A paper describes a structure:
SMARCAD1 is a chromatin remodeler, a member of the SWI2/SNF2-like family of enzymes that couple ATP hydrolysis to repositioning, ejecting, or restructuring nucleosomes. KAP1 (also known as TRIM28 and TIF1β) is the major interaction partner of SMARCAD1, with the two proteins forming a tight complex (Okazaki et al., 2008, Rowbotham et al., 2011). The SMARCAD1-KAP1 interaction is direct and involves the first SMARCAD1 CUE domain (CUE1) and the RBCC domain of KAP1. Remarkably, CUE1, a canonical CUE domain, recognizes a cluster of exposed hydrophobic and surrounding charged/amphipathic residues on KAP1, which are presented in the context of a coiled-coil domain, not in a structure resembling ubiquitin.
To improve the diffraction resolution, a KAP1 RBCC construct lacking residues 141–202 (KAP1 RBCC ΔBBX1) was produced. Crystals of the KAP1 RBCC ΔBBX1-SMARCAD1 CUE1,2 complex were tetragonal, and diffracted to 3.7 Å resolution. Similar to other TRIM family members (Goldstone et al., 2014, Sanchez et al., 2014, Weinert et al., 2015), the biological unit is a single, elongated dimer, which is symmetrical in the tetragonal crystal form (KAP1 RBCC ΔBBX1-SMARCAD1 CUE1,2 complex) but slightly asymmetric in the cubic crystal form (KAP1 RBCC-SMARCAD1 CUE 1,2 complex), suggesting that the coiled-coil domains may have a somewhat dynamic structure. The majority of contacts (i.e., ∼520 Å2 of a total interface area of ∼600 Å2) are between CUE1 and an exposed surface at the C-terminal end of the long arm of the coiled-coil domain of one KAP1 subunit, but the interface also involves the RING domain of the other KAP1 subunit of the homodimer. The α1 helix of SMARCAD1 CUE1 overlies and buries the exposed KAP1 RBCC hydrophobic cluster that is comprised of residues I338, L376, M378, I379, and V380.
Residue numbers in the entry:
A (entry chain D): 151 to 198
B (entry chain A): 59 to 94, 113 to 137, 209 to 409
The structure:
Amino acid sequence: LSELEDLKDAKLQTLKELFPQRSDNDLLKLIESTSTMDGAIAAALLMF
Amino acid sequence: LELLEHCGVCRERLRPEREPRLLPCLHSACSACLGPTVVDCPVCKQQCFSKDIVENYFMRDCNVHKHEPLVLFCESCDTLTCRDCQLNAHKDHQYQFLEDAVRNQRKLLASLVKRLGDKHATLQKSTKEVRSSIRQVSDVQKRVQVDVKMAILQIMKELNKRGRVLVNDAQKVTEGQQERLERQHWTMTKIQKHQEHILRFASWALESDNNTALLLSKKLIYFQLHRALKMIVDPVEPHGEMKFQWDLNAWTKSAEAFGKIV
Ligand SMILES: [Zn+2]
Ligand SMILES: [Zn+2]
Ligand SMILES: [Zn+2]
Ligand SMILES: [Zn+2]
């Protein structure tokens, strides 16, 4: 599953590129609530 | 260009006296610009604790052993050291010179940049694709908005053509019937006045019966002659049945069905 981890962490580092002030713990919950779609994560990010 | 050299809040040119520090995000701002645990970037985020901030070393045109400078690269610690540190701290730590370790680092960063640059070449191309796609989406919204409207009018244009034609049909029928009726009221009243006149004169002559027989009996021929005029007047009223209540084609339930889909 070590491949699956990096594909998850990849999307996380990008939210910090866009909206960075919110914590690393907060973004991780939304990148599972979205199922790691590249765009739909940035959707729920703007919502909160 | 005009900003890479400049500092943070004051945007000074890099003064090496300023003790400028380079954040992990690669932004640079002297320690005077930002004094205050975890330090945060003027632009990005507090990406790392202050323990991971180097001081920018840019003075255009060792930590421990004072004026002895660094020239030498400790291969076992990823960073440079002076001749002393590799005698006390890094004794027989396998070690290398600056001239070779820099050549390789430059050639690996050129690789990372040449690939990453080839990547940001596609955003410069996919930004234009998204930019043109938005105008399409809104154009493909305002053209479907007009195709429906103009198609609705083409239907209603032709329907009013076959709605007025049926009205003209009813128009024709009624002036034709009225022309018939107007010859049947014209015919009645003129025959009636002829009947009224004979009835009028014959009644008055007959009603005067006191020693009036001598005047009557001299005109019996023309009395009964003109009674034959009114014995056979020869018109009988016909009746035009009203069927315009049943020349309205009310198929209302069909109209909604074809309106339902489109
Ligand atoms: Zn400054
Ligand atoms: Zn930054
Ligand atoms: Zn070492
Ligand atoms: Zn040293």
